[PDB]
Assembly symmetry: D2
């Protein structure tokens, strides 16, 4: 409806999701980990695109109490909360045999357990109004299981099962819970990658084109619609034909 | 925008046509037998903002009818960039009692006819280098509840993925999407048993399936292809 | 148990499945389309490997009455029928826009409608004994949807939905119905293919190796076991890691 | 053959150990707390033909315990070529009542501990250029019935696919597999409601899940990897 909290909204997909919902007149809490100035930049642009209430909120979601507090902070600053987009996520890519306990733990913590925490707190608020929209930004690799990042794949596949369980548990309380699974989306960060990496990724995609963050946001805006009330428990891939889903 | 919607005289097809009418699509409203009901839909689509609506009768069990239908639609609309394969039939029965004819009819109308319509449409889209195809499949193509209909709808999901990958670099996308339709005609005891299976605890409305179709046919969905979206209240994993 | 009908058992996967079950002491009806002498070859080898009753049966499954008759012929020649492996299948590969009505119809007929016919007739017999094993040999492309053969993909995806429906409809009657989805299996026929084709196929496979027909047969032998009674409605991919299933 | 089976003192784990015993595997029987029950299983495995059986106590909630466990098993058996990650815990509750600790414990034991065991095993397998890993996951990782346990098991399916693809050319395979266990302890009304959902209309037996594990750990399954096989009486699509 009228409130949303978007995690990791200072750049890339989160920013696009933030700016897209601003265009729909949503009030927005723009969450960020470190780059506060960038988050403020997005907040100003969201205001310029039509958002009537925008606040920036800084939290390190690796801190257990941070993810729990974030939802209540967001609700306070917005005057309520009816929408949660769990977009934030980190990588610690390595081969399994070289992967340290900490490299695994950080990725599962930020990408899955933190999303637990935010989802649980958001549902408690949504249950009372008898309306809510929750969208988890997973990754196609959660389905495909491409090598080199078994930690990241486990986290994103877990996020999908998580999405289905919460969907089923809250469906008669007016809350939908869905996932959006980006393929290979071109951002400032992926452009930093070696040329060799880009071409190998690009090679896998039937559409023969990286996606744009704005495309992922369109799917997000569709699911958080009041008009998407009978869609729940679903994973929608935005990937140019990469995933057989 | 110019769209052919199959089986658009009632239920989900009718909802898709009226919803696309609201986006100002020109529309070819296909029907099998009930022409008058198709005209009523066509009248309502005009009233909702479609600048050009035409009705087209074709029995999709005739092979030449499916093929001709896309050409007829393109001629009446002045081109064709969207195809919504919604029309479908059932001939329900236990496998052990299922006659060859009852298998063949369901496969024909629901899958082979869709093959022919999609073939003809892609030819036209691939000239313009733009297209949207949405197959209305059913959750039972995944769940396989107790066989002709399920085979047809599963085959339709496979076909969607195949055609998506084949035309992905030609600016064409190909995607697939318990609803209150003629379903209201069913015994109260059957309905209530369906309802207990649905986490949302309510049947969907045709307009809800239509909203997903409208999103997928939008230019806002250009990077979505090969996908099957369930609109089902949490029913299917 | 003790009877099986294997379709398309004169070469490749069907032959391997035939020879594998012979090793388990099964009685076998070896079905073939055209190459009768090759079918007799397989029958002799099945005998040499331990099958106590082997018969060759010729049928063109494009003929509706052929697929229906086949099961009854098999039952007659074997003294009963408790196992059906639907392995037979044809291709008519072309781009969608060049695909003739007949190229589509032939592939759906032989690969799906014919399997209807055999499955329906087999279930009728199995229902009475309160035991049966049905395995459909699909293809990973039924899930993946690789281009160039939309007819073949529709047929194999339909075969999967079909497998699930019949599984659910007959599960309390002691019958299991499962599918085995071969990846890229090296046979006499695939070796005939241009070198360029082989390398592109091979390139997609994590295991970096074509499968052997014998490997597909091992999976088949597992599912038709009496010990596999709680497995039904499932699709088991034998593909070196190609399909995310 | 030398296998480590986690949580092998009872139910499915015990069935897997006894079934592998019949193929003459040397076995490391892991248990969390009930050592005596693990010894009983170890005794029965010897009696069924295992040439070398050892029991290993480790609380997989301790990070160093999971890591050490694979090294202990390899030392007692004289190597290790098979790992069956079967051990799992539940802390069931509605999401809105689910404490941080109850989420974390289930994720730890069911997923993070499996990460650590699999990591250690692949190191050893990848020296020998041969290995079999089977993750015992649960159909609920797919179905998502009403969240900690489901997340853990879905994550385990993802992890299986990821590790399969990473070690596919090293002669190692990585695969995943309502059963009558402690499930008999449940109220009759709960059991009967589960049964109505199962097309086969009966609960599975631990030995049936064990048979699938034995097939996947065989050299006859060398070209199967990255896959999840449900043993469920037709429950999951």
């Amino acid at each position: 409806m009228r409130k949303a909290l978007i995690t990791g909204a200072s750049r890339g997909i989160g920013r696009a999701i933030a700016l897209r919902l601003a265009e729909d007149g949503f009030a927005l809490a723009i969450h960020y980990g470190q780059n506060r100035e960038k988050a403020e930049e997005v907040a100003e642009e969201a205001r310029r695109r039509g958002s009537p209430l925008v606040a920036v909120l800084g939290a390190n979601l690796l801190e257990a109490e941070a993810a729990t507090a974030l939802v209540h902070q967001a609700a306070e600053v917005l005057g309520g909360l009816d929408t949660l987009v769990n977009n934030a996520g980190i990588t610690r890519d390595t081969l399994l045999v070289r992967m340290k306990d900490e490299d695994w733990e950080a990725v599962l913590e930020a990408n899955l357990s933190a999303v637990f925490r935010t989802t649980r707190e958001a549902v408690k608020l949504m249950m009372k109004a008898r309306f809510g929209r929750i969208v988890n930004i997973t990754s196609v690799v959660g389905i495909l299981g491409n090598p080199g990042q078994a930690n990241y794949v486990a986290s994103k596949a877990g996020l999908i099962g998580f999405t289905r369980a919460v969907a089923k548990e809250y469906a008669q309380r007016g809350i939908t819970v869905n996932a959006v699974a980006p393929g290979f989306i071109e951002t400032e960060m992926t452009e930093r990658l070696p040329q060799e990496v880009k071409e190998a990724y690009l090679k896998q995609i039937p559409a023969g084109r990286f996606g744009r963050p704005e495309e992922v946001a369109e799917a997000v805006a569709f699911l958080v619609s009041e008009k998407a009330g009978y869609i729940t428990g679903q994973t929608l891939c935005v990937d140019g034909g990469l995933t057989p889903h």
